[PDB]
Amino acid sequence: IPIVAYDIYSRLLRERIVCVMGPIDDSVASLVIAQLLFLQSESNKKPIHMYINSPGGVVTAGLAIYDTMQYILNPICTWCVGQAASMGSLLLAAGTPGMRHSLPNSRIMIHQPSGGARGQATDIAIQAEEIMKLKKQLYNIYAKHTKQSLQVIESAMERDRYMSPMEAQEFGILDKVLVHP
Amino acid sequence: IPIVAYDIYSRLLRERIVCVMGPIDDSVASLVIAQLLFLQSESNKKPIHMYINSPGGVVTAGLAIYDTMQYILNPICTWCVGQAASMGSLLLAAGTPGMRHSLPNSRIMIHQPSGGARGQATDIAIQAEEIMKLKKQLYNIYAKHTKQSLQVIESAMERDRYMSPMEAQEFGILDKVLVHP
Amino acid sequence: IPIVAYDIYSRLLRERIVCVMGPIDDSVASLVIAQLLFLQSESNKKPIHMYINSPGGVVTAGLAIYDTMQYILNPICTWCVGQAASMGSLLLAAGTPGMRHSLPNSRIMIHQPSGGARGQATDIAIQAEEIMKLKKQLYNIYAKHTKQSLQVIESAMERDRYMSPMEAQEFGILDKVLVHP
Amino acid sequence: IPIVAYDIYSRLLRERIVCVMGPIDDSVASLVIAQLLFLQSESNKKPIHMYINSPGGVVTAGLAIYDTMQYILNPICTWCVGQAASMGSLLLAAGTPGMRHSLPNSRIMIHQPSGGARGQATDIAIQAEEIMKLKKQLYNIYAKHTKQSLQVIESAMERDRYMSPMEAQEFGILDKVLVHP
Amino acid sequence: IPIVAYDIYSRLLRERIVCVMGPIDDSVASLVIAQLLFLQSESNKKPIHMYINSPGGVVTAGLAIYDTMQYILNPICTWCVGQAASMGSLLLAAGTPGMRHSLPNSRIMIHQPSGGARGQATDIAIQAEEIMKLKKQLYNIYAKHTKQSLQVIESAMERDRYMSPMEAQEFGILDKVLVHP
Amino acid sequence: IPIVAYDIYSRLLRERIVCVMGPIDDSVASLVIAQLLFLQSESNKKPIHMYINSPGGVVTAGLAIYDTMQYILNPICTWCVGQAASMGSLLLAAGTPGMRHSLPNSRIMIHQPSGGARGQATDIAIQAEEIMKLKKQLYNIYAKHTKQSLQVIESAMERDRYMSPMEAQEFGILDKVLVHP
Amino acid sequence: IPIVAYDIYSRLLRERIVCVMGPIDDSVASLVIAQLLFLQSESNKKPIHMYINSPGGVVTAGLAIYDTMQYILNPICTWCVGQAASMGSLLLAAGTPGMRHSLPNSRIMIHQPSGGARGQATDIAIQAEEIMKLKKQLYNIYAKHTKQSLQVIESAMERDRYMSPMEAQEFGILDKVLVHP
Amino acid sequence: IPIVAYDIYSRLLRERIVCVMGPIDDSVASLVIAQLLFLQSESNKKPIHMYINSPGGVVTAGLAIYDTMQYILNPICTWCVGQAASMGSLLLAAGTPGMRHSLPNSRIMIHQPSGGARGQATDIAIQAEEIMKLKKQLYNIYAKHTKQSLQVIESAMERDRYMSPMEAQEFGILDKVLVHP
Amino acid sequence: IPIVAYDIYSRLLRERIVCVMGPIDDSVASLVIAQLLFLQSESNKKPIHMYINSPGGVVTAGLAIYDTMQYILNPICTWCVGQAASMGSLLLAAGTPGMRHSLPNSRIMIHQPSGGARGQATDIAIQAEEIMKLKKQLYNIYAKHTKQSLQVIESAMERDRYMSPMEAQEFGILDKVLVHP
Ligand SMILES: *[B]([O])([O])[C]([C][C]([C])[C])[N]C(=O)[C]([C]C1=[C][C]=[C][C]=[C]1)[N]C(=O)C1=[C]N=[C][C]=N1
Ligand SMILES: *[B]([O])([O])[C]([C][C]([C])[C])[N]C(=O)[C]([C]C1=[C][C]=[C][C]=[C]1)[N]C(=O)C1=[C]N=[C][C]=N1
Ligand SMILES: *[B]([O])([O])[C]([C][C]([C])[C])[N]C(=O)[C]([C]C1=[C][C]=[C][C]=[C]1)[N]C(=O)C1=[C]N=[C][C]=N1
Ligand SMILES: *[B]([O])([O])[C]([C][C]([C])[C])[N]C(=O)[C]([C]C1=[C][C]=[C][C]=[C]1)[N]C(=O)C1=[C]N=[C][C]=N1
Ligand SMILES: *[B]([O])([O])[C]([C][C]([C])[C])[N]C(=O)[C]([C]C1=[C][C]=[C][C]=[C]1)[N]C(=O)C1=[C]N=[C][C]=N1
Ligand SMILES: *[B]([O])([O])[C]([C][C]([C])[C])[N]C(=O)[C]([C]C1=[C][C]=[C][C]=[C]1)[N]C(=O)C1=[C]N=[C][C]=N1
Ligand SMILES: *[B]([O])([O])[C]([C][C]([C])[C])[N]C(=O)[C]([C]C1=[C][C]=[C][C]=[C]1)[N]C(=O)C1=[C]N=[C][C]=N1
Ligand SMILES: *[B]([O])([O])[C]([C][C]([C])[C])[N]C(=O)[C]([C]C1=[C][C]=[C][C]=[C]1)[N]C(=O)C1=[C]N=[C][C]=N1
Ligand SMILES: *[B]([O])([O])[C]([C][C]([C])[C])[N]C(=O)[C]([C]C1=[C][C]=[C][C]=[C]1)[N]C(=O)C1=[C]N=[C][C]=N1
């Protein structure tokens, strides 16, 4: 990591740029929330830019970031660079309307959640009930921000669904596919 | 394994004695069914003795043995030696009425089934539905042979429930606790 | 393995009983085919009994057994004991019409094939084309023996589909659910 | 970890924000207590904000934090971000009354403690007695802060019990579910 | 294993000699019970000789053997060769009165049972209750055959208690310490 | 492996049936050659039946079998059961003209050889020259028995090429696709 | 570890607070002694606060800390936070009389030392003699600071003995159980 | 890493030199994009120099860098040092026309993408469709910057194709092969 | 690493001394090139000293360094300390004529390149062609700087060829063997 607020990510932080890179877990989520709360405290008016290059991650860690993005007053511009899959595509869609961007060659992928269950039949019934609830929760989120109906969402996310940026724009995950500024 | 129809288990087979020992898996189940079908073909009238010392095992392997025991015409005497837990307690209860035996110091344990699930939320919902069906199936079997109501069965099997032979007799899992012949 | 044509499976072979137990691989398939060809050479008229307790296995190994069952002149009675999943459910359905049996508590499961692919994009395109062809092949087989239409087959096998013996009979996988002979 | 009191968590510390993130162990507990004692020494009047995103952890480490929260004079606002399970849900409930918050999409889970025992029968009897005492201890804590009766607590925590924020508010684990400030 | 009913242990079986050697598990217990039932069927009058050299083993496997020894009509002579610890000392004490032997340099050891427990606090409470019951069970057995009071048994077995053959005879575990026949 | 010249493969050997099953290595090749030489010595006139279910194997081991098949005077009938890939498809094609068979659902696959090289640049140049020679060798063999030109062979084997039995017959790998005898 | 004498533990050191956290080994002991000697050199009059959250540790490492606590002139206040087991409970008891504190929900555990021995019988006799001496040493220490007789100490520490803070106060391990300052 | 903006890579950053070294993954891509955005913000007019020594890497990580290079207004000079294979050769070709350089002894390699697929046949069909789309995408990129037709691109990239710098210049991957400045 | 531009290698960098130590890989090559470009930018006239102690390394990483040495305008003095084998001997020979040095007891070794190949026969033919080209490339480099004919080079490098400094000077790898300055 190179040095220029000294190391390169801190130097970008002064620009109000937050990088969401790689798998999203609790540690990653913790960091991003900290930066979003810091950037809100520096000012509640200036936009924040979130650059997303992620294969996905943990649902509750992603929902933590998503709630933080909704809760802070700042407008948030989201940028898909390279890929946005699972949680990364959800966070991309959660950007302020008219402020959700992709580069020309990024890939978007959406799908239903996956997990596991163990134990006695009663413990398994509880855990299956919980992942079903989370599935419905996530589908509501995607319906809200993309404006697609629940039926469309359910049909699209049953299996892995890869999108080009133009397809994603048509779907409602993002607003602009920009080549040059 | 010692030699006396030559090795000691084959020598017992001539007595119409089948040994169900240790964990019950497909291989074990395969063997026991083979011996039961052989002993039926040698005669459909003479009783068979099943000696059970088992910690439990795979549900479908156990249900395979259980169905074989019901299907053949021979009366089957069951003997609890040492322990009968999970499937072993179910097979013990499945013996011909009035022919289900324990030695004085054997332990019986009954409980609900356990397992796992993996994959997408839809795959998990299917697998949880399947272990729930198996649970209801097994509870019906225990209710049939012990004469307890379903409510009693459900209450008893929610957690691990260890029994002395006298308790098991009271429950209806077995008929006789014998010290000497 | 006990001794009574001496060991218990050889002793059953004299009864024209073939055991298909556990995962189906090339070795298992090799054995079963050998026994079927032997039993045909001993006589082409007498029925053969195939007892199936299997979680599934390799497609080509299973198709090897399936072709052997069709090719020999003998009628083949199939028996589901414990479970028939994947290839095991297909082999169960491949028994001579009116001769396909389940015990009361067996579970049947049907689903589409699964696999993997690796290499260059051209190698992956070839391997995906091959598993697609195998899927269509298998669906034709199930349609033939169950008399369901292809559409029904495709709908049923998209995900894991567990069946009781009565459901399986309704589906057309088997003819008789027998409690006692 | 980015740099802006220089690194991002230290920069939040100046805001009197303590982050309780991931599994709670002795090291984590040590850190949180240190920060709480530091923030009390900086002033005993100003509130402290505890942001909780935790799957749970060690009972004594969690009880250490819980006692520290009760002992210091400062009011403590608790924030559920993402999830609060086991100890995390207990620490969330331990916040100053009227000051316990969740974001809209957080999950709360409550359950009884789990552990192990080994050794001679006398050693096992001691260890089982100890985890039983800890269970009663924890149930008293939850009853105190949620105002539910012990009977309700015992019924709810026998198995894993997941809650939405509104359900948690109804239960008494938290006071406010906030979308925007 | 050398050959002389051909291999050396089978050749001893014709003498009505059963060898209980090494750790006692289900497999070992299965074998010994099979031999005891065979030797009873050959005649119910002739004594059986059990030669014991064991460090101990599984409680239910040992109790299986112990019940078999009580159930068969034959008198059983027990021989301590080398050591009898845990279950081995219990099986030695279970021989027919006046027929329990040690060689001059054998060691006897008695102690309480050991085990483990895991899971939720409710599961641990059940498992601890079960090992306590087994402890009381075993102490009753030792009191019966040695004629010591329960209080003496409890005091002696709290910790590992090694005995010479003469001490064991004084205790009541055995009757004769023989140098030459 | 079951017993009926006693075990099932030996019992088939008396029928002049050789089984080529699974991966082809030196050991497998050794066995098959031994059986072919034995069956020739029993008579040079009677046909031999080779049943092939193989994923492939070592080139020199396969070429060993192939040369043996050409060298012995007996006509050889080849049977594809399940699959014939790599060497297995070559051995299938090497059967006596008009005597090469597939079952209806077998898969045939043909491809070029694969391997590795290591060492100094001079050692690598030698090893690459050797696998190139082997490639040309094998393509000549396939051209001979299928009657396709070298150009066709080279085009077909550049990548993995799966065939149905009818396609294989069209290609010239086999003569008859038989459903029933 | 966060930064505010800069990192949080150094910042507490300026308050004369020493943290004894987790397992006590030579490294941990080295650190604590260094801090105690530093804090004595800064002044011999001002009290030191030792916060203890420990599962236990090495006897000689703990005795090193204990001797340092006795040797320095400063009064030492000890605080049980979360747990004090083994050496942690001993160090808690070693605080200046009237200055030994617990929070309400801490657990105290006392027990005898444990270890191992290896080698020749002479080497084992030496090592057993050494752990016996250490046991007597430790029991004298506990008797001194708790004012219990040796007999009481020996009885209490034979097995693991868990205490609530009030029980510990009654025992004499600590003076005050404080809820709020 | 040596120190002279202090460490050697930061010291080069002040020269507007970005190093793309070794395998290209998300972390590497993240860093390079950060530096490119920083260098654009320092001025949009001054050229950037990208030094490439890479064996290749992840497609989406590489496409992320490639899109960033196109999006920023600065001209970008690319330098092949040592090797440019896979993504490294693509990034080399993506430099500003007339500004793409190689040293005399660098090797360029181009080839099609590689990957894997797993799961059900439907999941495999989706994943194969996705790598096919990515292949077409990449071939369009190479056609754009090298000015070769798609047919030429497809023919060249079917297998690994190594190039000297002069060959690469002829192909259109680069403009200048420089010995001295 | 000790501190005196602060750590010892940075302190030498101010002397225009670059250390090439141990195996040469991409990371090592990256560092050396960075330092050479930095030292050129500080001035294009002042010589650079390269101290070489290397067992060898990756060809393209070494060729990267070699091209950098040729490209920069500065004269480069090379010093063999301890050993120069493979790439290390090539880099030693690449120093400015009259400026290539060895200490008295250094060992030089030259040999041909080594590697590996895998895959289909076509992939292996490509990879063997590539290592052959690299071999010819390297032999041209050695011929250029040592002034030996290609025939001499080929003969010398077929096997490992160790040289004393005087032998190396005779060969033309270096100019001066210095005892004292
Ligand atoms: B995605 O592919 O990243 C996807 C999120 C999408 C639905 C918005 N991720 C998941 O579904 C994860 C997968 C995972 C499981 C286990 C560890 C790490 C990642 N599922 C969960 O996180 C999860 C959480 N609670 C219950 C079940 N599954
Ligand atoms: B018992 O304790 O043996 C119990 C049977 C009882 C309910 C009559 N066994 C099980 O429940 C087993 C546990 C197991 C799981 C996995 C491997 C081996 C054993 N459960 C199952 O076999 C099972 C089968 N299908 C679905 C889910 N679980
Ligand atoms: B079943 O669940 O057993 C199922 C067969 C069903 C469709 C009649 N099995 C498979 O689909 C197997 C799974 C498997 C993969 C790899 C090793 C072992 C088992 N699939 C294949 O065998 C296969 C074969 N060729 C290509 C792809 N997949
Ligand atoms: B929770 O799920 O985090 C839960 C706490 C809840 C009851 C408030 N955690 C536990 O119960 C832990 C689980 C655990 C065991 C072992 C290592 C780490 C975590 N139990 C204990 O910590 C514990 C402590 N002492 C005795 C027994 N169990
Ligand atoms: B002895 O030392 O062999 C002793 C038996 C004695 C009391 C007559 N053995 C045990 O107590 C065994 C130890 C053991 C545990 C686990 C695996 C193997 C051996 N205890 C048990 O077998 C047991 C059984 N059920 C519950 C708890 N412990
Ligand atoms: B096939 O897929 O089985 C194929 C044979 C076909 C061309 C008739 N097999 C091979 O090409 C084998 C693959 C292999 C390599 C290493 C171990 C085992 C199998 N190739 C060789 O055996 C081989 C032999 N000598 C040199 C190079 N490769
Ligand atoms: B306690 O549980 O931490 C306890 C101390 C108590 C008696 C005040 N600890 C010990 O007894 C330790 C256990 C241990 C053994 C080996 C490594 C680490 C910890 N015993 C000893 O340290 C020890 C030292 N010398 C001889 C024997 N045992
Ligand atoms: B090259 O050799 O680096 C090449 C890129 C070229 C086509 C411009 N790389 C790939 O094709 C990579 C290989 C790889 C696979 C898995 C992990 C790391 C690298 N392929 C992919 O990244 C990929 C991505 N999505 C789907 C399939 N393959
Ligand atoms: B030397 O011994 O360091 C020698 C270089 C000499 C010819 C100037 N090294 C090599 O030949 C290396 C060996 C190596 C292989 C694999 C990893 C690391 C080192 N060969 C190569 O680097 C290479 C590169 N491309 C193709 C084949 N071999």
Produce one character per residue of G119-141: b if its CB has 16 or more CB atoms within 10 Å, e if not. eeeeeeeeeeeeeeebbeebbeb
Q: Inform me whether the C-beta atom of residue B1 falls under 8 Å from chain E C-beta atoms.
A: yes
- For tokens 């340092």, name the residue: G68
G119, two tokens: 């080698």
Q: Could you give the CA distance from residue E5 to residue D166 in angstroms, rounded to a whole number?
A: 77
The residue type of B37 is L
Calculate ∠ Cα B65-B70-B74, nearest 5°: 105
Nearest to D33 among G81, G159, G180 (CB): G81
Q: Please return the burial class of H16, using the count of CB atoms within 10 Å of its CB with bins 0-12, 13-18 and 19+.
A: buried
DSSP letter at G23 equals -
Residues of C with Cβ-Cβ distance to B37 under 8 angstroms: 12, 17
Of the candidates H1, H54, H67, H2, the one whose C-alpha atom is nearest the C-alpha of residue H28 is: H54
Q: Could you give the CA distance from residue G153 to residue G111 in angstroms, rounded to a whole number?
A: 9
Pairing of the two strands B114-120 and A114-120:
antiparallel
Q: Could you give the CA distance from residue C117 to residue H121 in angstroms, rounded to a whole number?
A: 11
What is the C56 CA–ligand 3 centroid distance (Å)? 8
H or E segment and range at residue A51: strand A48-54
> In angstroms, what is the C-alpha Rg of chain A?
17
Catalytic-role residue among H49, H54, H86, H145: H86
Q: Could you give the CA distance from residue B150 to residue B144 in angstroms, rounded to a whole number?
A: 9
Q: Could you give the CA distance from residue D13 to residue D4 in angstroms, rounded to a whole number?
A: 13
- Chains touching D (3+ CB pairs < 8 Å): A, E, G
Q: Strand, helix or coil at E116?
A: strand
Which residues lie closer than 8 Å to A62 by C-beta, 6 or more apart?
Answer: A24, A29, A86, A87, A90, A91
Residues of H with Cβ-Cβ distance to A4 under 8 angstroms: 5, 10, 13, 38
Nearest to G82 among D7, D61, D137 (CB): D61
Sequence length of chain H is: 181
G102, two tokens: 């617990």
Q: Could you give the CA distance from residue I65 to residue B163 in angstroms, rounded to a whole number?
A: 78
Helical H runs in I46-147?
Answer: 59-71, 87-93, 121-146
B111, two tokens: 């409980």
Q: Inform me whether the C-beta atom of residue I34 falls under 8 Å from chain F C-beta atoms.
A: no
Q: In whole angstroms, what separates CA B67 from the centre of its chain?
A: 11
Method used experimentally: cryo-EM
CB-CB contact of A76 with A47 (8 Å): yes
Q: Inform me whether the C-beta atom of residue E37 falls under 8 Å from chain B C-beta atoms.
A: yes
Q: How far is CA I75 from CA B170, E69, F24, F131, I141, in A?
A: 100, 97, 62, 48, 18
Q: Could you give the CA distance from residue B168 to residue H79 in angstroms, rounded to a whole number?
A: 83
* G108 close to ligand 7 (CB < 6 Angstrom): no
Half-sphere exposure in the Cβ direction for B42 (13 Å, CA): 16
Helical H runs in chain I?
Answer: 8-13, 26-42, 59-71, 87-93, 121-146, 150-157, 165-171
Residue D179 burial (CB count, 10 A): 9
B32, two tokens: 């026991």
Of the candidates E154, E152, I93, H45, the one whose C-alpha atom is nearest the C-alpha of residue E172 is: E152
B47, two tokens: 């009783």
Residue I153 burial (CB count, 10 A): 20
- For tokens 């169950």, name the residue: C146
Q: Could you give the CA distance from residue E152 to residue D170 in angstroms, rounded to a whole number?
A: 58
DSSP letter at C114 equals E
Residue I129 burial (CB count, 10 A): 14
What are the two backbone dihedrals, phi and then psi, of residue A17, each rounded to the nearest 5 degrees? -110, 125
Q: What is the DSSP string of H89-117?
A: HHHHHTSPTT-EEE-TT-EEEE---EEEE
Produce one character per residue of C138-168: b if its CB has 16 or more CB atoms within 10 Å, e if not. bbebbbebbebeeebbbebbbbbbbbbbeeb
Pairing of the two strands C100-102 and C76-85:
parallel
Residues of E with Cβ-Cβ distance to D114 under 8 angstroms: 119-121
Calculate ∠ Cα E168-E173-E175, nearest 5°: 85
Q: Could you give the CA distance from residue C77 to residue C96 in angstroms, rounded to a whole number?
A: 6
Q: Could you give the CA distance from residue F15 to residue A53 in angstroms, rounded to a whole number?
A: 65
Q: Strand, helix or coil at G158?
A: coil
CB-CB contact of E15 with E51 (8 Å): no
F1, two tokens: 């492996």
What is the E23 CA–ligand 4 centroid distance (Å)? 35
- Give the number of the ligand closest to the Cα of residue H65: 8
Ramachandran region, residue D136 (left: φ > 0; alpha: ψ -120 to 50; beta: rest): alpha
Distance from CA of E15 to the nearest CA of B (A): 12
DSSP letter at G96 equals P
> In angstroms, what is the C-alpha Rg of chain B?
17
Q: In whole angstroms, what separates CA I140 from the centre of its chain?
A: 14
* Percent of chain I that is helix, strand, coil (3-state, to 5): 45, 25, 30
Which residues lie closer than 8 Å to H3 by C-beta, 6 or more apart?
Answer: I5, I6, I7, I10
Residue D155 burial (CB count, 10 A): 12
CB-CB contact of A86 with A51 (8 Å): no
Number of H helices, E strands in chain H: 7, 8
Pairing of the two strands E114-120 and D114-120:
antiparallel
Q: Could you give the CA distance from residue H88 to residue H54 in angstroms, rounded to a whole number?
A: 5
Which residues lie closer than 8 Å to E79 by C-beta, 6 or more apart?
Answer: E49, E50, E51, E52, E101, E102, E103
Q: Could you give the CA distance from residue H104 to residue H180 in angstroms, rounded to a whole number?
A: 10
Q: Which atom of ligand 5 is nearest to the CA of E58?
A: 22
CA torsion sign for F28, F31, F37, F41 is: negative
Nearest to G103 among D38, D67, D141 (CB): D67
Per the DSSP assignment, residues forming a β-bridge with A48 are A76
CB-CB contact of A54 with A28 (8 Å): no
Q: What is the DSSP string of F122-162?
A: HHHHHHHHHHHHHHHHHHHHHHHHH---HHHHHHHHSS-EE
CB-CB contact of F76 with F106 (8 Å): no
Helical H runs in G14-118?
Answer: 26-42, 59-71, 87-93
Number of H helices, E strands in chain D: 7, 8
Question: Can G30 be counted among the known catalytic residues?
Answer: no
Mutate to test the interface with C, among H86, H123, H124 (most CBs of C within 10 A): H124
F62, two tokens: 């396969």
Pairing of the two strands I76-85 and E17-21:
unpaired
Nearest-CA residue for atom 2 of ligand 9: I86
Per the DSSP assignment, residues forming a β-bridge with A49 are A17, A77
Mutate to test the interface with H, among A81, A89, A110, A159 (most CBs of H within 10 A): A81
Helical H runs in D14-164?
Answer: 26-42, 59-71, 87-93, 121-146, 150-157
C32, two tokens: 């079963």
CB-CB contact of C181 with C103 (8 Å): no
Nearest-CA residue for atom 18 of ligand 6: F58
Helical H runs in C14-120?
Answer: 26-42, 59-71, 87-93
G28, two tokens: 């941990």
Q: In whole angstroms, what separates CA E163 from the centre of its chain?
A: 15
Residue E18 burial (CB count, 10 A): 25
Q: Could you give the CA distance from residue B157 to residue A120 in angstroms, rounded to a whole number?
A: 11
G78, two tokens: 């000890």
Q: Inform me whether the C-beta atom of residue I178 falls under 8 Å from chain F C-beta atoms.
A: no
CB-CB contact of I91 with I62 (8 Å): yes
- For tokens 């490209």, name the residue: I71
CA torsion sign for D11, D15, D18, D19 is: negative
Q: Could you give the CA distance from residue D31 to residue D19 in angstroms, rounded to a whole number?
A: 10
3-state secondary structure D36-65: HHHHHHHCCCCCEEEEEEECCECHHHHHHH
Ramachandran region, residue I16 (left: φ > 0; alpha: ψ -120 to 50; beta: rest): left
Q: How far is CA F13 from CA C103, F18, F23, in A?
A: 37, 6, 20
Task: With both helix axes pointing from N to C terminus, report the angle between B150-157 and B121-146 in degrees, rounded to the nearest 10.
Answer: 120
Pairing of the two strands C48-54 and C17-21:
parallel
CA torsion sign for I100, I106, I111, I114 is: negative
F77, two tokens: 């009938």
Q: Inform me whether the C-beta atom of residue H40 falls under 8 Å from chain I C-beta atoms.
A: no
CB-CB contact of F85 with C130 (8 Å): no
Residue E45 burial (CB count, 10 A): 8
CB contact under 8 A, A112 and B120: yes
Residue I178 burial (CB count, 10 A): 12
Catalytic-role residue among G86, G89, G102, G106: G86
Q: How far is CA I156 from CA D103, I109, I152, in A?
A: 74, 10, 6
Q: Inform me whether the C-beta atom of residue B112 falls under 8 Å from chain A C-beta atoms.
A: yes
Pairing of the two strands A48-54 and A17-21:
parallel
Per the DSSP assignment, residues forming a β-bridge with F18 are F50
Q: Strand, helix or coil at I177?
A: strand
Pairing of the two strands A76-85 and A48-54:
parallel
DSSP letter at B96 equals P
CA torsion sign for C122, C123, C128, C133 is: positive
Residues of E with Cβ-Cβ distance to D131 under 8 angstroms: 121, 124
Nearest to I114 among F116, F121, F127 (CB): F121
Nearest to E26 among B1, B2, B22 (CB): B22
What are the two backbone dihedrals, phi and then psi, of residue A116, each rounded to the nearest 5 degrees? -150, 165
D102, two tokens: 């969740």
Q: Which atom of ligand 8 is nearest to the CA of H130?
A: 26
DSSP letter at G110 equals E
Residue D75 burial (CB count, 10 A): 15
Distance from CA of A5 to the nearest CA of D (A): 6
Which residues lie closer than 8 Å to C22 by C-beta, 6 or more apart?
Answer: B26, B27, B30, C28, C53, C54, C55
Q: Which of C26, C63, C67, C114 to mutate to test the pocket of ligand 3 (most atoms within 8 A of CB)?
A: C114
Sequence length of chain A is: 181
CA terminus-to-terminus distance, chain C: 27
Q: Could you give the CA distance from residue G103 to residue G166 in angstroms, rounded to a whole number?
A: 10
Q: Could you give the CA distance from residue E68 to residue E143 in angstroms, rounded to a whole number?
A: 19
The residue type of C38 is F
Per the DSSP assignment, residues forming a β-bridge with C176 are C101
Calculate ∠ Cα A102-A105-A110, nearest 5°: 65
Q: Could you give the CA distance from residue D40 to residue B49 in angstroms, rounded to a whole number?
A: 75
Q: Which of I20, I54, I58 to mutate to test the pocket of ligand 9 (most atoms within 8 A of CB)?
A: I58
Q: Strand, helix or coil at H23?
A: coil
Residue G18 burial (CB count, 10 A): 24
Of the candidates G101, G90, G1, the one whose C-alpha atom is nearest the C-alpha of residue G51 is: G101
The angstrom resolution of this structure is 2.4
Task: With both helix axes pointing from N to C terminus, report the angle between I59-71 and I121-146 in degrees, rounded to the nearest 10.
Answer: 40
- For tokens 């001394």, name the residue: I17
Residue A75 burial (CB count, 10 A): 15
Q: Please return the burial class of E143, using the count of CB atoms within 10 Å of its CB with bins 0-12, 13-18 and 19+.
A: middle
Of the candidates A67, A54, A68, the one whose C-alpha atom is nearest the C-alpha of residue A25 is: A54
Q: What is the DSSP string of H43-99?
A: -SSS-EEEEEEE--B-HHHHHHHHHHHHHSSS-EEEEEEEEEETHHHHHHHTSPTT-
Q: Strand, helix or coil at A96?
A: coil
E143, two tokens: 């009191």
